[PDB]
């Protein structure tokens, strides 16, 4: 989520 | 949450983050604001710095990385803190 916006809860698409 | 007119823009991290990023296997001195989102990313995920039911809180007192960030912990929703902690610890090129 911090790159592209992604979103999700798990620490990968958060982190993302 | 990067732009992507800016994924793309070259960094300079000073010394502590670049220990961070040479531990998870990078070997570069330039990088590119995606790519130090992405091994600190990993940084975190090889060393289980993150809760496990709570997976969003990083606690990182005991790590480098509570040196580098200057907090004992953070949550991975507050984004405009961590880029002000990543860019704290870089420098952008113009
Ligand atoms: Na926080």
């Known amino acids: 989520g911090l790159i592209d916006g992604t979103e999700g809860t798990d620490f990968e698409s958060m982190w993302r | 949450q990067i732009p992507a007119s800016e994924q793309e823009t070259l960094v300079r991290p ?14 570069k001195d ?12 990993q940084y975190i995920m090889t ?5 496990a039911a709570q997976q969003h809180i990083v606690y990182c007192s005991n790590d480098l990385l509570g040196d580098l960030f200057g907090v004992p912990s953070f949550s991975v929703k ?3 803190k961590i880029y ?6 870089l420098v952008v090129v113009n």
Do not use: C, W
């Open chain 2, 30 to 41: 330039t990088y590119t604001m995606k790519e130090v989102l992405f091994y600190l990313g």
């Open chain 2, 14 to 27: 000073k010394p502590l983050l670049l220990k961070l990023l040479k531990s998870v296997g990078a070997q």
């Open chain 2, 84 to 89: 002000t902690m990543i860019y704290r610890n």
């Open chain 2, 78 to 80: 507050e984004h405009r």
């Open chain 2, 47 to 51: 060393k289980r710095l993150y809760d």
